[PDB]
Design a protein around this ligand. Structure first.
Ligand code: C2E
Ligand code: C2E
Ligand SMILES: C[C@H]1O[C@H](O[C@H]2[C@H](O)[C@@H](O)[C@@H](O[C@H]3[C@H](O)[C@@H](O)[C@@H](O)O[C@@H]3CO)O[C@@H]2CO)[C@H](O)[C@@H](O)[C@@H]1N[C@H]1C=C(CO)[C@@H](O)[C@H](O)[C@H]1O
Ligand SMILES: C[C@H]1O[C@H](O[C@H]2[C@H](O)[C@@H](O)[C@@H](O[C@H]3[C@H](O)[C@@H](O)[C@@H](O)O[C@@H]3CO)O[C@@H]2CO)[C@H](O)[C@@H](O)[C@@H]1N[C@H]1C=C(CO)[C@@H](O)[C@H](O)[C@H]1O
Lengths: 678, 693
């Protein structure tokens, strides 16, 4: 069987039309065998003899897309030195473009014998692991254009690929819960009409169903257990797992771009599915353990800075190269538009590589900072302080107004000194972590007993109010207050400076029963129920529309304040400008903000001045009715455009005209917006 | 008309309707884009939109050929390392084309000549170089990067101007220019010599040092870079307003058509702005603490052994500039590889491993940069940073130990045969343990640093007084022997020996494992009159004199041909040696196996090396066996006639193919055939090579 020396680059299996180049890195390896799997369970093994800077490689003529392959590394098994090579284990190609199968849990997938953690286990793992597959790279994108929606026009919608469409009645059964279902015109239509410009997907890199969850009757639903950083998770594909999942994902991106929607991927580079020293041996632990993972003071064991078993070695050059090769691959070959990272001196070279890379540095780079306000000036960040503060406003925490004013206006205290814009602030009321929007107005405390960890998992301080009853209620008064509270949250988010993120299904009032950490619930707890929910839907679409049609809510600069033209002003509910004393009043829970649509200094794309209507934002988060006074001349008139006290949705319902100096009564825990054209 | 534009890419990008301008500075309070007109006047525009400290604007209607520059308003505080000074017209570090030349006066300095810590408010615009907007268009046609594997590579280091300044076939307009490099007479000379890669000495735009100009000298070699994205304008016949780009591309396109790669000597470790008394041209005025490694008293600059300043290699925008530069020269200028010098002098507490870790990380992972030829000059042997053998295994290196050892052997230095055997076979002791191939050692006997080949056999000591530093510059320990007289001679005996010695060096280079590098003009026996550091000699000291069928050229062309025809001299694996076929064997001149006693004897100055051509284990590109003839290399590094016995069975015949003591050149002359067991005497300081099928 013909074997040529081939190329050390690129890494992985590269098909050229007549054959396939294989190249895999290990500096611990003594010998590396490429194993070609056949459909009958047999193997043909061929040595990767040619080595260049510890990359072994060979080109194999006649090897074609669809071929299943793996690697066997012959090398030391010395855990006291951090070496865990075990040639009985068929290893996943870290660069695999497609991964087939699933893990069948048993002794074979572990590298140690089932009595002793530091001895060696000799059963062949090949029939019980996932396997890499050679991919044909061809895909006709036609006129595919990346939307390149600027941040001040962005609305992010975080969605789970399976849960978003698992119960959608317009889709055929085999598209439901799949990548292809994302391409369905009904799903794309709903995202379009919501005003969504960026679909952020929960992890789509090939991950593993944790043995712990499988053994407990659960499954890894969210996917924060990556094993394949180049392969789209095969369980979300209905077209098949031998390359077809690549085709599926690409056609989903292509359909979303035809609708003008960006694809952002949640990517999890901080750990892998191989876990701690008692986890399985599937790819990197068997390839080169000290080069990939951060090892403890005792090299037998793994630094676990996240709770997820292990930690990638961020100073290691082939870890950095893999991460970058992966980001470039998802942008350049999968046509995604950005990334959401959790990197829970060590990150310095990583940040250096991101910043200078001409492909990656130009996509949307969104960070989970957990480090709030400390990512480099090209990163935007999830603003958890925004979430906690807005949650505090509407639950009545009694000194929130001063901080809420900052969060409402882009959190300058967090980003201005770094040299960023308010658009660095990704604001959100809910996400996949914690309560859904409806559970947040319905539960004081989390209900995660179905996750099998004794209610020890998930956030303990939810900053939530059940509105008078824990859980589901018959009371129409509670039900209506809950519905307004949800409107308060959604409206606060769409009227805030920064970049707003919505959590899939919140536009429908999705509930998880008070489960605030549903990572392991691949069932009706989490799946979107497609459709009272018509008032919430109408209210959300119109709130997104208001934001889209008024630039003063989405400025590129921080508000200037009063110069010693005024672009923003703060008033008491009785209509007097607010003093420094006013900000500390203990039961200060109400406020009027004036936003001056005549005072937007940022030019538009061709240098033109940007003009807008002006607004009055009246917040009552006391538990009582309050009279507000429109601060203005008695002859100037203001149109009420938002009133979250309206049970039918204002918007889209439109409101009365108000004269300056005229009193208006706001219901407890309510928001009203007025719109004088100026 | 001014639009916000974009912060990426950095520099002036022309789209067809106008030009985007983006420049980095963390220290600036305001940045003014200045647009110079041919009458000296300026139209200033603020770069108001700022993003991660990149200020940018798009100017519709601004066209290629537009001269521009930056003025940074910001703090002048040398105590804090801030040297922003809006009176200085600063260069765009990303300038694709730099026009003009520095006119040395007080206006180009950030400080007044009496007080280094005061601010100099003179306008610098009439005395500095200016950046030029360029049209990126170029029709490359069928252009292909040769991607010549290392085991087929013959490098030829050349100075753009000196290579062709005196070439009689070129019209005067082209002599010494990028256009000159593309002349069919120049390309044809390289093709016939066997050259596969042309390594050009610094072509990045550089500055004529004030200390040289105020001495009647100039900067000829160019290790004083100011523009890392622009081809040096003084090497361009076509003009300096954008044409220098087109001319450089023409040269690369012409060389690729002959199948010759371009390697660029690149100097990223320091700039032409020098220490705190140097001028303020680009980066010192833009963001001084971001660009330069500053001393603990930030007024002052850490340096890199006496160049003046040192780029901050841990700075993200320094790394981005270097990577952008590398990518630009590869992707758009189409060059094939780089020779780096990353030397610096760090204070005790800091280490080179942490200074360059990100840089090496960046280079290894980048899809474009990591796939071109990456050649490093190591720190020199004493002042240890990255010493030879230490660069990461993706890199190849100038092997200075090869140079020293082969010079010592043909000098007759006492105990050289041991190290020589190692250098001759790829320097296994420098490259085998780190996982590299013998192709990691760029071998050479001469380069632009030190003596030319002819001077290496003509002088015991350097003569650098014309360079203006009292003979203190350049290497003191050349490992040279003048063959019996210092300087030129009319003695026929010393001339014969000098010619033989030059064939010894070239034959030794071409038979050694590794990648050979030739120094331009050594094929014509170029001389510098014993000047061993001719960096400031832009004159007949340095330029190549072209002949008007010389023995040396004929001998060199055929030695390169000998290597190209026989894979045993350019293997991809280190020699296995004895255990088990035997691929290499070492013999005394009397013809018996070298023991460990023979390598260390004082008298050990002569060797017979056997190279087994049926023992090449590494496959070719389609997995087939590589086969070659077998060879005997007989070295007489002693100073007497010496008898060698052919170490072979009693009835096998060998062809003599190299004999450096033949004065008409062998090769290409064809010698006789000898039988195993025969005695043949070799002249002192001579080399004979025998070939058997
Ligand atoms: N960067 C790079 N360098 C190479 C390669 N092949 C050889 N080198 C070098 O050539 C020397 C001799 O290789 P050899 O004749 O095959 O002699 C080798 C070979 O017979 C065998 N060996 C080493 N590695 C392997 C391997 O991976 N597979 C097999 N089948 N044999 C190996 O043991 C001998 C001594 O091995 P070394 O100490 O490593 O010394 C090696 C090694 O330094 C390569 O593919 N890439
Ligand atoms: N002509 C000129 N004036 C400058 C500049 N930088 C600051 N200023 C002026 O001084 C005001 C205070 O600036 P700030 O502290 O940076 O507070 C700024 C700053 O944090 C932010 N920001 C404003 N423009 C930009 C920008 O272009 N890029 C980024 N990343 N942030 C900006 O908006 C806030 C309010 O800015 P303004 O309303 O415009 O009001 C600014 C502006 O009038 C400049 O480079 N050129
Ligand atoms: C292994 C680990 O699984 C479970 O942890 C899951 C979390 O409950 C989820 O909240 C989810 O966290 C991710 C966030 O949703 C996301 O926003 C992102 O930032 O990454 C987060 C973490 O990666 O994903 C986790 C599952 O992927 C479980 O609750 C947790 O207790 C489990 N840790 C056990 C594992 C062993 C070692 O294998 C021990 O090290 C630990 O002490 C165990 O508790
Ligand atoms: C400024 C510096 O100019 C002279 O230094 C030159 C060297 O003599 C040349 O040999 C050449 O060195 C380069 C190598 O050829 C090359 O292989 C590469 O590795 O880089 C080397 C250094 O870049 O190029 C140099 C000039 O371009 C001169 O001999 C030297 O004395 C001069 N240094 C003076 C400058 C002042 C500050 O401005 C002080 O710091 C020093 O003490 C001065 O001596």
């Amino acid at each position: 069987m013909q074997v040529w020396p081939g190329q050390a680059y690129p890494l992985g299996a590269t098909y050229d039309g007549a054959g396939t180049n294989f190249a895999v890195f290990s500096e611990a390896a003594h010998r590396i065998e490429l194993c070609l799997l056949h459909d009958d369970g047999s193997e043909t093994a061929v040595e990767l003899r040619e080595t260049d800077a510890f990359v072994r490689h060979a080109y194999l003529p006649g090897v074609m897309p669809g071929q299943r392959y793996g690697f066997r590394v012959h090398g030391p098994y010395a855990p006291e030195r951090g070496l865990r090579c075990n040639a009985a284990k068929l290893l996943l190609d870290p660069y695999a473009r497609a991964v087939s199968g699933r893990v069948r849990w048993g002794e074979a997938v572990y590298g140690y014998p089932f009595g002793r953690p530091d001895a060696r286990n000799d059963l062949d793992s090949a029939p019980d692991t996932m396997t890499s597959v050679v991919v044909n790279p061809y895909f006709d994108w036609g006129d595919d254009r990346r939307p390149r929606t600027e941040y001040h026009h962005t609305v992010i919608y975080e969605a789970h690929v399976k849960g978003l469409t698992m119960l959608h009645p317009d889709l055929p059964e085999e598209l439901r819960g799949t990548y292809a279902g994302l391409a369905h015109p009904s799903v794309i239509g709903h995202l379009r009409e919501l005003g969504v410009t960026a679909l952020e997907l929960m992890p789509v890199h090939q991950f593993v169903n944790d043995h712990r969850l499988v053994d407990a009757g659960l499954s890894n639903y969210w996917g924060y257990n990556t094993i394949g950083f180049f392969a789209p998770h095969n369980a979300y594909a209905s077209w098949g797992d031998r390359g077809q999942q690549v085709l599926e994902f690409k056609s989903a991106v292509r359909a979303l771009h035809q609708a003008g929607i960006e694809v952002i991927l949640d990517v999890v580079y901080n750990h892998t599915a191989e876990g701690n020293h008692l986890g399985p041996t599937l790819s990197m632990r068997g390839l080169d353990n000290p080069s990939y993972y951060r090892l403890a003071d005792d090299p037998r064991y793994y630094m676990d800075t996240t709770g997820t078993g292990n930690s990638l070695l961020m100073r290691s050059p082939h870890v950095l190269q893999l991460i970058m090769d992966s980001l470039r691959y998802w942008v350049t070959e999968m046509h995604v538009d950005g990334f959401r990272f959790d990197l829970a001196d060590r990150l310095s070279s990583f940040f250096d590589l991101v910043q200078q890379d001409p492909v990656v540095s130009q996509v949307k780079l969104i960070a989970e900072p957990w480090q709030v306000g400390n990512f480099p000036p090209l990163w935007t960040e999830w603003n958890g302080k925004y979430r906690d503060c807005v949650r505090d406003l509407w639950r009545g925490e009694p000194r929130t107004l001063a901080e809420f004013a900052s969060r409402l206006t882009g959190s300058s205290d967090l980003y201005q000194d770094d040299g960023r814009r308010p658009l660095a602030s990704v604001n959100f009321v809910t996400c996949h972590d914690g309560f859904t929007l409806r559970d947040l107005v319905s539960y004081n405390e989390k209900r995660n007993e179905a996750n099998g960890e004794g209610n020890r998992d998930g956030e303990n301080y939810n900053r939530s109010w059940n509105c008078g009853e824990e859980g589901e209620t018959e009371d129409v008064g509670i039900t209506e207050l809950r519905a307004r509270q949800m409107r308060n949250f959604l409206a606060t988010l769409m009227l805030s400076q920064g970049v707003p993120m919505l959590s899939h299904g919140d536009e429908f009032g999705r509930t998880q029963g008070g489960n605030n950490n549903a990572y392991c619930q691949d069932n009706e707890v989490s799946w979107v129920r497609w459709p009272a929910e018509a008032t919430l839907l109408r209210f959300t679409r119109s709130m997104v529309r208001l934001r889209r049609e008024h630039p003063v809510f989405r400025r590129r600069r921080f508000f200037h304040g009063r110069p010693v033209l005024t672009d923003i002003a703060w008033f008491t509910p009785e209509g007097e400008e607010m003093t420094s004393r006013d900000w500390q009043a203990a039961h200060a829970q109400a406020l009027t903000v004036f936003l001056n649509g005549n005072a937007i200094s940022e030019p538009g794309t061709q240098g033109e001045r940007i003009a807008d209507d002006s607004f009055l934002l009246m917040f009552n988060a006391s538990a009582k009715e309050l009279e507000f006074v429109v601060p203005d001349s008695h002859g100037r008139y203001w149109r009420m455009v938002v009133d979250t006290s309206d049970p039918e949705g204002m918007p889209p319902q439109q409101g009365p005209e108000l004269a300056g100096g005229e009193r208006v009564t706001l219901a407890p825990l309510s928001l009203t917006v007025l719109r004088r054209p100026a």
